[PDB]
Ligand binder design. Structure first.
Ligand code: CB7
Ligand code: CB7
Ligand code: CB7
Lengths: 136, 136, 136
């Protein structure tokens, strides 16, 4: 019921140097989860292996995942395969509109196995993902 | 003569949750190697860097490798380049038939430099790889 | 003014087993930097995450980077995105002529955001990169 895992991939630690930092993002997400009667567990890593371990744990616990894989979105089959194990919903979030930039950003290995996908609505995208999981 | 390195990539630790676990696989491989008069050293990691170090060691020791790179099979040039250094045979194994699934799984950076490749014969594929190395 | 970061990616630790080793390369680069009135800080890792941290530090310090990403050159969007943060020049170096080999080596995620690119001039490529940064 309560626990939602928010997982951020490579370079998302560099947020705010917008002016919103990753710590600020964690704080916004936590607050919104509280207002929605959820607990958000937010994690970020530049390491593919660390991201896979976190997905493994969400699979074993049957908890939902909101995932912004950063660059790995367009490149990693390993991450996609880890996510394919999830039984609870997977929501893909991108801060920027990945369809308005380079062609390589318009393909995601994650989109076809995600429940849904939100892009280009900024940091609010994460909050809106939270809200979707709350009404489901 | 005796030593064969079996290297498993990302997500192969999730075997059995088939019902064959990775530990079970290690056990099957070891037994078969013993019956063939070989020693199997089996290793698994979700970390590309760890996989590359293991390939580096096989190159320096001039020992054979049976490799199931998981997702990295379709994506990693770095791993392919590490494997290109091997002087002893490289056998590529996939549990599933990667040619019966998504198009992206039908390209391997490893196949063109491998001695040969076995797919879709399940866990027995590893054992059959062992047997090939024993008669060569 | 003085500091230039030279960053080597996966498999570059295997140099010399040419006969030039990575340690030898570090030594050549340092000497040339000294003769040019610079300091070269040379680093190598098989770990994408480690490479990204080093790029993050160059971005925060506003220092230049000479980067040979190895295999990650052709595959990593995450590394490209990290490098896009650099305000000082980025020079891409490849020891081999990547345009004379397999087709996959003829695409780089880094070239379009690099100041310039040197390939196929061997280890001297790094020294020539140093010299460019010295006259700019
Ligand atoms: O959510 C995304 O828009 C995306 O997933 C798009 C994806 O295609 C891309 O790989 C990505 O990482 C981009 C990125 C990551 C780090 C940096 S630092 C300066 C620019 C920059 C850009 C990201 C993550 C991202 C987005 C905006 C920002 S601003 C500082 C970092 C960062 C990361
Ligand atoms: O040997 C393969 O068939 C392959 O190399 C194919 C390759 O295209 C793929 O990246 C891969 O990793 C797939 C994978 C890895 C982990 C998991 S967990 C639930 C599904 C799943 C799937 C694998 C490894 C693989 C195969 C079957 C199974 S079952 C649980 C994990 C796993 C991993
Ligand atoms: O600078 C390059 O030419 C390149 O960036 C080209 C790039 O397309 C490739 O991924 C790469 O890594 C290649 C590589 C890396 C390690 C090894 S060990 C035996 C062969 C080999 C080849 C490299 C790095 C490279 C180049 C030459 C040598 S010789 C031993 C390692 C190595 C690495």
């Amino acid at each position: 019921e309560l626990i939602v895992n928010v997982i951020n991939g490579p370079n998302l630690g560099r947020l705010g140097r917008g002016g919103t930092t990753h710590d600020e993002l964690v704080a916004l997400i936590e607050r919104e989860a509280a207002e929605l009667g959820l607990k958000a567990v937010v994690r970020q890593s530049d390491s593919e292996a660390q991201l896979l371990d976190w997905i493994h744990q969400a699979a074993d616990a049957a908890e939902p995942v909101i995932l912004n894989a950063g660059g790995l979105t367009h490149t990693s089959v390993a991450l996609r395969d880890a996510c394919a194990e999830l039984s609870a919903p997977l929501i893909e979030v991108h801060i920027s509109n990945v369809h308005a930039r380079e062609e390589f950003r318009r393909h995601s290995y994650l989109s076809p196995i995600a429940t849904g996908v939100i892009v280009g609505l900024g940091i609010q995208g994460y909050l809106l993902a939270l809200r979707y999981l709350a009404e489901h």
